[PDB]
Amino acid sequence: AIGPVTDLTISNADVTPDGFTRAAVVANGVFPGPLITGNKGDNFQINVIDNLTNATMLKTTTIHWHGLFQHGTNWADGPAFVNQCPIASGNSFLYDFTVPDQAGTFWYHSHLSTQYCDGLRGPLVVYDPSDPYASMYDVDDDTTVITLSDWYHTAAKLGPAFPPNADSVLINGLGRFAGGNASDLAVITVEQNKRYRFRLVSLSCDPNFTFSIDGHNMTIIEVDGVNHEPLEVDSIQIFASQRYSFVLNATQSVDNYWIRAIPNTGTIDTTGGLNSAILRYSGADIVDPTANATTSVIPLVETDLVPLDSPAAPGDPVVGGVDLAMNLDFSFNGTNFFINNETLIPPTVPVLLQILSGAQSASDLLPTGSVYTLPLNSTIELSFPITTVNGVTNAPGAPHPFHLHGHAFSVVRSAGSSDYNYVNPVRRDTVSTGNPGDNVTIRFTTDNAGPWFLHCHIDFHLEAGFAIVFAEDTPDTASVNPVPTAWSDLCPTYDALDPSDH
Numbered sequence: 084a085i086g087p088v089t090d091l092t093i094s095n096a097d098v099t100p101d102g103f104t105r106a107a108v109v110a111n112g113v114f115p116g117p118l119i120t121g122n123k124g125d126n127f128q129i130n131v132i133d134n135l136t137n138a139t140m141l142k143t144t145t146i147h148w149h150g151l152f153q154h155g156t157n158w159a160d161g162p163a164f165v166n167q168c169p170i171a172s173g174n175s176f177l178y179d180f181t182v183p184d185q186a187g188t189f190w191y192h193s194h195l196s197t198q199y200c201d202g203l204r205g206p207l208v209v210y211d212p213s214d215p216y217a218s219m220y221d222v223d224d225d226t227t228v229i230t231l232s233d234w235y236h237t238a239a240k241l242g243p244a245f246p247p248n249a250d251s252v253l254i255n256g257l258g259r260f261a262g263g264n265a266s267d268l269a270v271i272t273v274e275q276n277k278r279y280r281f282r283l284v285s286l287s288c289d290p291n292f293t294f295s296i297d298g299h300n301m302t303i304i305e306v307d308g309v310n311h312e313p314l315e316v317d318s319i320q321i322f323a324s325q326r327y328s329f330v331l332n333a334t335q336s337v338d339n340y341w342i343r344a345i346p347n348t349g350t351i352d353t354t355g356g357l358n359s360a361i362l363r364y365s366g367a368d369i370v371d372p373t374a375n376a377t378t379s380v381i382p383l384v385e386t387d388l389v390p391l392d393s394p395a396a397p398g399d400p401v402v403g404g405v406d407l408a409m410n411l412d413f414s415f416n417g418t419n420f421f422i423n424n425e426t427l428i429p430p431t432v433p434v435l436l437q438i439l440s441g442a443q444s445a446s447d448l449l450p451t452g453s454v455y456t457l458p459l460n461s462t463i464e465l466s467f468p469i470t471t472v473n474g475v476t477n478a479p480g481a482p483h484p485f486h487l488h489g490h491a492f493s494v495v496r497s498a499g500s501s502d503y504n505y506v507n508p509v510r511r512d513t514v515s516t517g518n519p520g521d522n523v524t525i526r527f528t529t530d531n532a533g534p535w536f537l538h539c540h541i542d543f544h545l546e547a548g549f550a551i552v553f554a555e556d557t558p559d560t561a562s563v564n565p566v567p568t569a570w571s572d573l574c575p576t577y578d579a580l581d582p583s584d585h
């Protein structure tokens with residue numbers, strides 16, 4: 084598609100992906116936003132131009148590049164009031180970062196409040212010119228990126244704080260709803276005998292999908308950017324913001340098959356052509372698939388995923404055997420979520436800026452009680468217990484997929500299991516915290532200077548303040564992250580704007 088140097092033009096326009104036309108916030112006119120492409124070691128320069136006129140979906144914007152470590156470029160990370168002030172309408176801003184150590188599938192989405200649910204979301208792929216799996220597949224390009232997105236007929240700010248379900252599930256940006264127009268479905272074409280590398284992206288706001296293909300199989304090689312040992316899989320449970328790359332061996336008779344993406348919540352049912360896309364072998368008739376969905380006997384299990392390189396998790400194999408152990412006490416008061424008796428209500432001055440202003444200790448950072456300081460070259464173990472309590476159950480709205488910015492973590496203990504794995508646990512940038520009784524525990528090493536966000540990636544929870552910030556190596560933040568003029572120009576230019584022009 085575009086990149087590695089290009090412009091993202093962000094504008095308000097009416098779009099109709101499910102048969103229903105509604106105004107949205109979109110990148111380069113099309114939803115989901117255009118595929119940004121680059122190679123390992125390429126220097127990305129993305130000139131985000133803000134041309135927004137609809138106040139109700141926010142005229143100001145900021146884009147995060149999910150899964151990209153952003154070393155030396157913490158300013159360019161995205162999160163509003165953590166890493167930068169939002170870009171004003173009528174202005175433009177350049178995101179100038181190199182990606183030297185990273186190879187695989189990512190995505191980019193607006194990180195200002197709930198804007199990305201209103202449309203500002205697109206896939207982002209970095210390709211590896213020496214990809215250890217290039218002798219597995221024949222095709223990998225634009226028409227192999229499969230984008231799963233939940234879609235809403237009512238706008239983010241206009242509907243409830245916590246939407247119960249999506250109106251439609253969009254595959255490659257095309258799906259249907261209940262009393263649906265029965266309009267266009269997504270069409271993925273394949274040639275006989277040819278291997279396909281499919282890059283599966285979850286641009287979801289809330290629901291998690293059970294992704295499956297009729298009469299076929301998926302061989303996962305990649306989870307959330309990180310290269311993993313090949314896995315035999317029937318169906319993939321992909322939580323919000325997660326990514327998977329699977330190689331599909333096109334070995335079945337020339338026919339139309341269903342590409343299925345059942346969400347966990349909402350209208351679960353293939354009848355109507357809802358939650359579906361078309362897998363069409365080249366030469367079969369331009370009709371709807373008549374294929375049926377079988378039961379899953381070899382489904383995706385997290386604990387089964389093993390990293391391709393450097394599989395051992397940091398820290399010695401012990402519960403607590405780590406430099407800094409931290410446990411997150413969750414709770415919910417009706418409107419807002421809480422981590423350690425605190426909620427993230429975003430400060431006037433970005434967490435980053437605060438450090439460049441000379442702030443150092445956790446006591447001096449804002450918001451207070453929510454910014455934790457982490458020393459460098461120390462190993463960190465986090466744990467997300469979803470508990471049933473005395474009869475209360477903290478953190479409803481489960482399961483919650485927690486994402487850590489600027490790091491790829493080893494998931495030593497996964498949802499649904501109580502065993503700990505330190506020898507070769509899966510390595511990813513967002514993990515499901517699961518259901519009550521799951522003490523999901525993750526480990527990662529502090530190899531990145533600057534402030535980083537840790538939040539549930541269900542965007543409606545994010546807005547409820549289910550988040551904390553890691554001020555990782557505060558003394559070196561200033562120096563290790565050189566800030567361009569455009570970035571420092573943002574906060575004085577943004578605070579001048581009226582709530583009307585927000």
Ligand SMILES: *[C@@H]1O[C@H](CO)[C@@H](O[C@@H]2O[C@H](CO)[C@@H](O)[C@H](O)[C@H]2NC(C)=O)[C@H](O)[C@H]1NC(C)=O
Pocket residue numbers: 095105106107137138139140236237238241
């Ligand atoms: C700005 O965007 C909003 C939300 O995207 C639009 O709100 C629509 O308003 C009409 C009448 O109030 C409703 O029937 C629709 O439900 C709203 N859309 C959504 C998605 O909720 C609004 O029309 C926009 N203003 C313009 C004209 O650009």
Ligand SMILES: *[C@@H]1O[C@H](CO)[C@@H](O[C@@H]2O[C@H](CO)[C@@H](O)[C@H](O)[C@H]2NC(C)=O)[C@H](O)[C@H]1NC(C)=O
Pocket residue numbers: 402403408409410466468470522524
């Ligand atoms: C979830 O797991 C963590 C450890 O991985 C538990 O936290 C530790 O629990 C022990 C008691 O077993 C305490 O002495 C430690 O001080 C705890 N670590 C802290 C304070 O970060 C945690 O209790 C588990 N959650 C539950 C209740 O299952």
Ligand SMILES: *[C@@H]1O[C@H](CO)[C@@H](O)[C@H](O)[C@H]1NC(C)=O
Pocket residue numbers: 416417418419426
């Ligand atoms: C819930 O917490 C939020 C933020 O802390 C607050 O605005 C609201 O007043 C709280 N509701 C209750 C139970 O008082």
Ligand SMILES: [Cu+2]
Pocket residue numbers: 147149192324486540
């Ligand atoms: Cu994300």
Ligand SMILES: [Cu+2]
Pocket residue numbers: 147148149150151486487488489
């Ligand atoms: Cu991210």
Ligand SMILES: [Cu+2]
Pocket residue numbers: 480482483484539540541544545549
């Ligand atoms: Cu959540």
Ligand SMILES: [Cu+2]
Pocket residue numbers: 147162194486488536538
């Ligand atoms: Cu984030």
